[PDB]
Each structure stands twice: as structure tokens, then as C-alpha cells.
Amino acid sequence: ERRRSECVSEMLDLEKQFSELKEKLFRERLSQLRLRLEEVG
Amino acid sequence: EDYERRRSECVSEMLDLEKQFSELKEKLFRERLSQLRLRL
Amino acid sequence: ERRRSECVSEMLDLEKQFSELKEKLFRERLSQLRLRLEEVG
Amino acid sequence: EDYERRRSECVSEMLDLEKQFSELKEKLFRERLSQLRLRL
Amino acid sequence: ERRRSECVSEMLDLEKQFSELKEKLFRERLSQLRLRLEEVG
Amino acid sequence: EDYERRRSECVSEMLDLEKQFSELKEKLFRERLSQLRLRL
């Protein structure tokens, strides 16, 4: 179980970072699209 | 622009669902981590 | 390879659950949207 | 409502693609697990 | 750290393949939709 | 067909974001792998 818990801990720690990265990436694309929408009018 | 608008709606929808999924994945990871550490 | 197979087994077991969670989450949002669509008419 | 309709189409499209991806990820996990267990 | 690095190496190797699979899956669906769009006209 | 068009825009948007995410995930994996191998 120790090999298993160290693996799961590591992946939780990475997934926490991947989640933040994905949300920030989507938010930037959403902001870019909303700005472009405005610029066209 | 309908074009920019439709694309923004798609991205907003997926952004909101991703935020919720992330929570759920993190919940499941921590739950399993606890279970392994407590031999449950 | 044993440390590796225990890591992969653990992650397959989690990913099986994450997949179900993601599909159920998308399905609920799809049902909510279809109901709202109907309610507006 | 075009608004609710467009959003529902986006979510349905992504739901269907996610269901397929999940299958493929599970396939690859099991394949690698087998290979490691059989030293292949 | 060795149990941890072997776990992370394994998962990086899988995620590299999952990424390719996801992009190819999305591309095929995009091509199918664009063809259908054309066929309707 | 507006129908096929809207769906194609949603998929194209998500395809482009997925390609970028994959890069970022791979970057983070390699960075952590290096750090663990170098005890950093």
C-alpha cells in the first residue's frame, strides 16, 4: 500500500496543478473571445 | 458577431464543467489517498 | 516493474471512476439545458 | 431559445467525445497493465 | 523518491499517448462535421 | 446547415484548447520527473 499511496499522492499533487492550468487556459480563451466579440460589435 | 459569441458560449460552458470536474477528481484522489494511508 | 504495475493499476482504478463522474456531470448539464430550452419554448 | 439550444449542442458534442475518450484511455491503461504484469 | 519517479515516468508515458488519442479523436469528429456541413450545403 | 456549423465550431475550439493543454501537462510531468530524478 505504500508504493500505492506514494503514487496516488504524487498524482493528486500533479492533478491539482493540471486543474489550475486548464482553468486558466480556458479563462484566457474566454476573455479573448469576449474582447473580440466587443471589438466587432 | 454571432461567430465570436457562439464560440465564447461553448468555452464558457466547458470552463464551468471543467471547474466542477476538477473538484470531483481532487475529492476522489484525497479520498483514495486517505483510504490507502488508513488501510481502509 | 512491480512498482510500475501497482502505480498503473491504481491509476486505471481512479480513471475508471473519473470517467464515470465526468460523463454523469456532462449528462446532468445536458438534461438541465434541454429542460431550460423547453421551458422557454 | 437559441441560447439554451447552442449550449446544449456544445455539451452533447463534448459528452459524446468524452464517452469515446474514456474508452480509449481505459483500453490503453489495461493494455499497459497487462504488458507490465507479463514483462512484454 | 524512486517509487515516485517511476510512477511519474509511467504516467507521463501514458499521458503522452492519451494526448495523441484525444487530439486524433477530436480531429476526426471535426473532419466529419465539416464534411456533413458541406454535404448539406 | 447552421446545425453542423455550430457543432464544428465547438469541436474546433475544444480541439485547439486540448492541444495546448496537452503541451502544458507534458511540460509539468517532465519538470516534476526531472526534479525527482535530481532531488530538487
Ligand SMILES: [Cl-]
Ligand atoms: Cl447557467
Ligand SMILES: [Cl-]
Ligand atoms: Cl451525430
Ligand SMILES: [Cl-]
Ligand atoms: Cl482564433
